[PDB]
Amino acid sequence: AVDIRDVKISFPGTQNPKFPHLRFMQTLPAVRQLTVCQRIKPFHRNTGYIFSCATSNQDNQFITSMYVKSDGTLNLGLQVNASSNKYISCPIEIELGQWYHVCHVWSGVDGRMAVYANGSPCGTMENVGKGHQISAGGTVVIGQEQDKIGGGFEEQESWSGELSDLQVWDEALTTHQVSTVASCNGIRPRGNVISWMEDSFVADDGVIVGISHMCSL
Amino acid sequence: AVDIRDVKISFPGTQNPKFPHLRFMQTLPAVRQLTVCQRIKPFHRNTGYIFSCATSNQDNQFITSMYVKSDGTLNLGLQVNASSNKYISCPIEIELGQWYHVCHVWSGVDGRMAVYANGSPCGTMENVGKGHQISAGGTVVIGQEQDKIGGGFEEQESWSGELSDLQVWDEALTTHQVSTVASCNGIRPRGNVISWMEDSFVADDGVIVGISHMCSL
Amino acid sequence: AVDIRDVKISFPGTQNPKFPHLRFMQTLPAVRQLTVCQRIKPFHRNTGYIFSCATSNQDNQFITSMYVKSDGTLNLGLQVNASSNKYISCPIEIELGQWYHVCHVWSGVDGRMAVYANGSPCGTMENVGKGHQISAGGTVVIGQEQDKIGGGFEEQESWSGELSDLQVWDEALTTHQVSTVASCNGIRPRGNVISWMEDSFVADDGVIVGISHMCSL
Amino acid sequence: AVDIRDVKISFPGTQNPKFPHLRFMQTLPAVRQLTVCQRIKPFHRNTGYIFSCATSNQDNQFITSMYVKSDGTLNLGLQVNASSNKYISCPIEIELGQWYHVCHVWSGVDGRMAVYANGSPCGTMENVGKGHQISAGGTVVIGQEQDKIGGGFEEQESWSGELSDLQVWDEALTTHQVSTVASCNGIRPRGNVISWMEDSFVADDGVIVGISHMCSL
Amino acid sequence: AVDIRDVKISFPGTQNPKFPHLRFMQTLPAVRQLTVCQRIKPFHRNTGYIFSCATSNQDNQFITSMYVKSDGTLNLGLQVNASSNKYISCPIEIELGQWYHVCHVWSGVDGRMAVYANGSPCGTMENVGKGHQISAGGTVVIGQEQDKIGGGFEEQESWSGELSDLQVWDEALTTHQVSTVASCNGIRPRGNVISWMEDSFVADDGVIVGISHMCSL
Amino acid sequence: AVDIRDVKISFPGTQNPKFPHLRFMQTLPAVRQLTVCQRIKPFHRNTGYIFSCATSNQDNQFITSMYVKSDGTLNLGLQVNASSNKYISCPIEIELGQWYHVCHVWSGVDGRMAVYANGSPCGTMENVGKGHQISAGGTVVIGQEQDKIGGGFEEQESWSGELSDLQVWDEALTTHQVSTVASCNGIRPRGNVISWMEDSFVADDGVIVGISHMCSL
Amino acid sequence: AVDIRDVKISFPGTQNPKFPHLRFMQTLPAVRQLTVCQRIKPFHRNTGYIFSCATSNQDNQFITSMYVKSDGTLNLGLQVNASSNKYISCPIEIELGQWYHVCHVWSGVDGRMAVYANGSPCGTMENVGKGHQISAGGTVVIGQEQDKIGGGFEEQESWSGELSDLQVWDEALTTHQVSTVASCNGIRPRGNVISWMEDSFVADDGVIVGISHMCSL
Amino acid sequence: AVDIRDVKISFPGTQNPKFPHLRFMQTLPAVRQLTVCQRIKPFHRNTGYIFSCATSNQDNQFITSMYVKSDGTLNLGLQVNASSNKYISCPIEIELGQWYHVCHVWSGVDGRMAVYANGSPCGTMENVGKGHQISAGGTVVIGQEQDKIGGGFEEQESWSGELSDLQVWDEALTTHQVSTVASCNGIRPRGNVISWMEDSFVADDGVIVGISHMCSL
Amino acid sequence: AVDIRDVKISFPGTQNPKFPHLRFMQTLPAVRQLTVCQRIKPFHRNTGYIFSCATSNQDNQFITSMYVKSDGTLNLGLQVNASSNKYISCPIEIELGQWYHVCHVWSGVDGRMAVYANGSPCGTMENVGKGHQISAGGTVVIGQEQDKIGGGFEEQESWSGELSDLQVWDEALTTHQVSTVASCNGIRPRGNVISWMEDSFVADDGVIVGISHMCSL
Numbered sequence A, B, C, D, E, F, G, H, I: 001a002v003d004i005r006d007v008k009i010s011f012p013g014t015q016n017p018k019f020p021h022l023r024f025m026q027t028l029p030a031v032r033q034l035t036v037c038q039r040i041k042p043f044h045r046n047t048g049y050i051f052s053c054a055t056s057n058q059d060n061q062f063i064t065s066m067y068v069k070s071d072g073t074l075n076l077g078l079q080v081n082a083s084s085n086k087y088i089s090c091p092i093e094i095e096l097g098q099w100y101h102v103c104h105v106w107s108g109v110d111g112r113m114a115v116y117a118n119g120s121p122c123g124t125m126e127n128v129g130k131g132h133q134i135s136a137g138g139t140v141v142i143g144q145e146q147d148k149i150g151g152g153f154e155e156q157e158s159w160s161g162e163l164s165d166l167q168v169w170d171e172a173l174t175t176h177q178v179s180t181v182a183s184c185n186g187i188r189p190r191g192n193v194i195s196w197m198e199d200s201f202v203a204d205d206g207v208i209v210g211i212s213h214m215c216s217l
């Protein structure tokens, strides 16, 4: 009946010392490219970090984030190897509490960054982590921004809302491929690095496990 | 590929002030009967409480527990409306770290208690909560014993190990029905009160979300 | 998913002035024979009337009842045209709170009465309403005994428990046919006089609408 | 043959001390969003409350209602956390005694309210329960307006007519999803909070259980 | 081979003391709406009553009739609670001896009357039995007009011809639903109040039982 | 759903001037053999004539009958060309009100008579209408014995009970063929002379049209 | 392989005392309407009678005939109750030796006559046997005109050619229905009064039994 | 529905000058072997000739016949090229009016004759038309014995009864093959010389065309 | 793999005393119409007779022939009852050595002749054997013209080439039917008089048996 890809996690809200988050048990391998796709229902307009990857020597190896502009426009950001946050605007009005499919595509081979909203390209940006290779052993945390491996969280950088169908590949997916990932009734692909609910993660500080009805009612 | 019924939660180990546990978001309705079935992989021989249900006036409405005797024999216990713990031994040697299907069947209509290990009856006991009806609004916690709604946990009463496929019905399932519930390749029924991964729950204090390989490799 | 034949009604318990019951909206046609089959989960051992049919001139046209003997043996009774209650014992131990399929077969053509438990014949009795034809316009009430059309209920004659799959035919089904009616995975026949959930009925005094798990979990 | 989703309940008419209604046995979990969809056949033009949710400290947590304007236009109302009733008109002429699919979509995350008639959007309204989260333990009553948990009904606020296929989700369904819910020959989705005939409810004061022929004859 | 819905009854012709007719064995439940559909082959142009429903205190609860105007136009009439006969003309030329599908839709909730010929709407009429509810226990006679329960027939009000596929619902079917009922190769729906050949009836005064070839040759 | 072969006719009881019966519209062709099979539920033990065939010059061309002996044994009789009634006893105890399949096989070619109960041979008799050929134009009446074409009925020769699946062939079916006719879940053959519900017949004096549940519930 | 509906009979030619013909063994029931359809291959242009029905008091109850006009146009005639022959011309050129589907539709209810050639309407005629009902017991002869039951044939009124697929109904088929009867690859319907090769008939005076290749080669 | 192989012909009885018979339109080719199989229902015990083949110079080329001995035993005869009749008795009691499958196998190559009853071998005979080859142009008549091509019939040599499924091969079928021919539910083979209803024949002197119910009811 | 309908016979060339030909073993029945269709590959332009039918008193009962005009145009001829050869030109250029489907349609009923090339009509001719009926017993020879039964061949009238799929019916097929016969991928019909390779024939004077690749390679 209910597919495992539709399981969702709710990140209630953050307030020191409570930081709802997930931390994947297995560290990532070294990667030269990364595509992070997932379904999200944001609870606030201000900036929040969703996917955070940190190594012993670099707490900011790869970090995705978002925020909603005053006009309701979605802004997707990416930070690689402690670079400044690179933002790309998406031509879609965000209604807090509604579901959206978001994907960040990064390639250190050519330094190209691209983001997608609901399976459609929002635009690209050059010189983002160009020539950079994320060293092996990266620890992934969801919902909080790491300043130390698995910790050093800050409430102003947390992301509250609901998340599901997190899929990560160590390749830079094409525009066409991202649309096949977003499709609710599509093949619903599984990442080779992280496949939602197939790669163990620690749940802490009151996250809520439930079901997402973005695709199936 | 992977069925949502095979999702598992690991309860690492308890040590104040850390109490890994789950708390279901929705309270239970009033019930005169209850059957709690689930797959478990115990980490220790000493007594631990698995399913704990509490109301404002009675923190001990319904509590399941287990422990392994010196000879390796499984003992399943039940406590209803603050009664003493009633234990029924099962003719099966327990190996910590291995999977077992356990089910507790309770009927307040006739006061009969029955427990099952791997789909087979271990025995029954009379006068357990006879004539008792669990009042509406019971809060369910997994892995810890409540002394207060959603809290008042005690390390000596915690249960560590892995749990999956939790199914709860507000009826007293028959011996034959329990065997159809336990079967790995059977129909894998879903409880009408609580259906694993279909009824939201809060995850806290470091529980680990993963996949159970008791049934499917 | 869930079949309408598995919908159940719970009759909580009776205490003046509260009499949980059902009353069918349409009166029955004249009949010379009647077979009443249904799934029941009794809450008490003392006598209770399940199916009650009354006309303006005869509040006791056809009434089914049951009670459990001291040894746990099931006793099924029938009363036709204000006759005395005729009881036939069934070779099955009743556990209050458990499901059982019960059927009463009556034929006014030859005056024969026969009852069945879980699809098996318990025995027969002669001279029960022999030559009697239930006059047209009978009102059917479930869970209470009528002393007046749709009323005049008495607490000591009420039946508490859960009921489901009520099927009524204006024929006297054979022993073989009743076994095909009882089978949980059988064709699950629908009565031509009353078909569960296909013939409207008034629900009153706190009956609970839910699902029966006697057949499907 | 007949699907459980087509079972209907008739609310005859209210007159103190008789208040036909349904009360769900299980209280709701805490929610920040809610979508209530159902098929209704109204018996009167004046205002009536259909879905009423109340907690110990707030009898008016969430209440749906409707009324027909002088020109026959349908007006759908919603009240959250004791706010005033917010009404949105639907471009459809109502004929008392005819079936219509109605749905109320509420999101406390952004405070947006939206209503649908026969699967089509009627319009939206801002600032309805914005930032409000319905506290856990809400009791749901159908057909009457609660002034106390499960009671305190008032004849002038009751709703008479026929109701079927009640489905409730703790999410704010999109315009497209509501159309898939309304379709008679569609997938006929089941709510995750309340699924018609899958979540027990008490029937009282003469409600009539029957079959709806809005979709299947 | 031959479906039961195609069985037909021929009403030869009436002449005191012979009144060919059918009388259903079971009385109807109370209804606030009624839809009567059937296939008919009229033998005469003058007015004849087809469906007659009577209670102890009202011999004219619900009566359908028809007649052919001078120009061959079909006129369908309805009388509710002893009101005057309300007629609606149908844009179809009637050839005595030919088959036609006729349906009468009545709603006491809004007092709306609508008739259909061969699955197409002929028109509607307001204020027909508005607010009227047919009391329970109505006796249905086909082919004759009752002035007394099951009798008091009058030759000048009888209807001669062939009739088949009589289906009655206690709801006011929509225009679209009536077209699905009329279709010869459609689903051929069965009424919930009266389903042709599934609800017993007395045949008297020389009616002829045969097969209708309106739909299948 | 319901097959036309399961339609049944009830012959309530006879009392001058009321003689419930059926009369086939079409006369039979000349035949030198005849097999009459049907399902019957007898209401009385005394002799009654079921199938009566008469021509202008011979009201007793072919007549079937039955009666139950004191010990409950079934006796099947046949009369051809005004011969005396020939009876053959069947090894089966008859319970009034129960269904039985009965068939009469007659061959004027060799003058052999054979009867069957529930598809099994009861025995045979020689010299019954040997060399006799039923002249063309025979009128068939069911439930009454003709002393004149379509009339001259006598209450003491009437047959009361329920009848269904009447099949007549102008051949003398073999013992094996009769068993294939009786089988409830068999091919359910249709006679070439008279096929139940496919050959028109007049219904008179209050016969009741309904459904037989001998084979399908 | 070969369907029974394609069996054909050849009427060689008539010359006293030889009159090739068929005579149905069973007489017809009383009818107020009649539709006679069949496939024919005419051997001559002059008038010939195909279907002849006679009763003791009326040798000309119903008679069909045809003839080819000088320009090759087909003329179909009908005579009812000894009326004069009514002819309707068909817009089709007849080639002796070729197959054609012909059907005569008659309704005594309204006195309308209609004929069809190859499934298409040729026209209609009023006042043909209006109000007339063919009395029961009509004997049918094919290929000759009866002046006496089964005889009194006249060579100048005989019809020579090949005939197949004779289907007769006691209803007045519609224009659309006749087209479905004529279609060679259609459902090939069977009449309820006479079904080709399913209703026995005497063959006499040298008719030839063979196969028709009008539809299947 | 009805297969052409089940069409039957009835030979009523012979009485000069009336000789019911069939004569095949096409003469046979020269053959050195012949197998004649068919289903028959005999009307008399005395000798009758069924299949008669004659050429200009030999009216007795091949003739089959039968008769029933005093003890009811079937005797099958064959005559080839004016030889004396050769009889082989079959171990089966014949009941006039019942169906039997009979087959005659002849081989002029070795002069062997073999007959079968109901698919079983009755025995063989040597020196029957040994070395004889039936000359080309043989005319086949059924039911009468030819003394001249297509005529010269004699009442005392006629065969009365019913016949169906006549199949003729110009080969000497084996014992096993004859059993596959006789089987009612088998492949029902068609002869290469004469295939029932596929080879034209003249019907004369009152034969009756109908349907055989030996195999299908 | 290879269908019997594609078997071909090659007629090498004729030179006294060698006359390659085929002679069918069985003579034809009497016919009033005849259609002869077959596939041919001609080896010469001069006239040749393909199908020759002769009786004792008429060696020229029915004869088909062809020849190619100077411009390459195909001419098809027919002779009936010793009439002169009637020729109809076909709008197709013939290439000796190539395959063509040819069919001759003759009707003695109206005296019409029609020929077809490759399934298309070439034209018709009147007064060809009008009123003539080919007497029974005709012997068919292929490839030579008979002046005596099965002989009297003349080299100047022989036909050389390849022939296959010879199909003969005793009916006059329509234009449409001939097109369905010619189609290589069609149903490939089989004549009822002569079916290629299903009706035995003598092969003599060096004909060559092989396979035709006109339709299947």
Ligand SMILES: [Ca+2]
Residues within 6 Å of the ligand: A059, A060, A145, A146, A147, A148
């Ligand atoms: Ca950081």
Ligand SMILES: [Ca+2]
Residues within 6 Å of the ligand: A145, A146, A147, A152, A153, A154, A157
């Ligand atoms: Ca930080």
Ligand SMILES: [Ca+2]
Residues within 6 Å of the ligand: B059, B060, B145, B146, B147, B148
């Ligand atoms: Ca506690």
Ligand SMILES: [Ca+2]
Residues within 6 Å of the ligand: B145, B146, B147, B152, B153, B154, B157
């Ligand atoms: Ca504790």
Ligand SMILES: [Ca+2]
Residues within 6 Å of the ligand: C059, C060, C145, C146, C147, C148
């Ligand atoms: Ca009483």
Ligand SMILES: [Ca+2]
Residues within 6 Å of the ligand: C145, C146, C147, C152, C153, C154, C157
């Ligand atoms: Ca009482």
Ligand SMILES: [Ca+2]
Residues within 6 Å of the ligand: D059, D060, D145, D146, D147, D148
């Ligand atoms: Ca309130």
Ligand SMILES: [Ca+2]
Residues within 6 Å of the ligand: D145, D146, D147, D152, D153, D154, D157
């Ligand atoms: Ca209130």
Ligand SMILES: [Ca+2]
Residues within 6 Å of the ligand: E059, E060, E145, E146, E147, E148
């Ligand atoms: Ca009246």
Ligand SMILES: [Ca+2]
Residues within 6 Å of the ligand: E145, E146, E147, E152, E153, E154, E157
């Ligand atoms: Ca009146």
Ligand SMILES: [Ca+2]
Residues within 6 Å of the ligand: F059, F060, F145, F146, F147, F148
């Ligand atoms: Ca008599």
Ligand SMILES: [Ca+2]
Residues within 6 Å of the ligand: F145, F146, F147, F152, F153, F154, F157
């Ligand atoms: Ca009598």
Ligand SMILES: [Ca+2]
Residues within 6 Å of the ligand: G059, G060, G145, G146, G147, G148
């Ligand atoms: Ca005449």
Ligand SMILES: [Ca+2]
Residues within 6 Å of the ligand: G145, G146, G147, G152, G153, G154, G157
């Ligand atoms: Ca005449």
Ligand SMILES: [Ca+2]
Residues within 6 Å of the ligand: H059, H060, H145, H146, H147, H148
């Ligand atoms: Ca002879």
Ligand SMILES: [Ca+2]
Residues within 6 Å of the ligand: H145, H146, H147, H152, H153, H154, H157
């Ligand atoms: Ca002779």
